[PDB]
Amino acid sequence: SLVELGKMILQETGKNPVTSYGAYGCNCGVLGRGKPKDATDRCCSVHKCCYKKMTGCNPKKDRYSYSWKDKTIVCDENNPCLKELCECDKAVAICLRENLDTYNEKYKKYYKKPLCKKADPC
Numbered sequence: 001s002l003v004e005l006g007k008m009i010l011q012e013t014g015k016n017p018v019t020s021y022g023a024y025g026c027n028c029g030v031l032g033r034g035k036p037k038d039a040t041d042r043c044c045s046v047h048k049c050c051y052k053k054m055t056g057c058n059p060k061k062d063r064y065s066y067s068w069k070d071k072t073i074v075c076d077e078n079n080p081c082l083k084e085l086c087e088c089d090k091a092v093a094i095c096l097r098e099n100l101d102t103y104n105e106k107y108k109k110y111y112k113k114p115l116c117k118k119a120d121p122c
């Protein structure tokens, strides 16, 4: 759920997830998807796509178990949907950390979301 997702982002990036990514670019946070402005934003587009693979569980609501050991995230649910959900969130946290070097302040509070162009195909 949002809870674990937030914790993983915070752990990997060292940033407050809501303020830093809550409305970033065309895909991060509130609202939907749109053509990515930059690599950070593309992480969010990929993440939203990932959520489409879970049928049997609610990406936003369903809590799950994971471990934060050795600067790594490990998804430990046996339940396949919750395992896959955890893996979606792990991947976006890792992606955002990886793209910290191009994180752009100007896309943080993105009131231009309605100017976004067509999203990338999932």
Ligand SMILES: CCCCCCCCCCCC(=O)O
Binding pocket: 002, 003, 005, 006, 017, 018, 021, 022, 027, 028, 029, 030, 043, 044, 045, 047, 048, 092
């Ligand atoms: C209030 C709890 C915090 C929720 C953390 C998620 C906020 C931004 C996450 C970005 C992920 C995405 O947009 O795909």
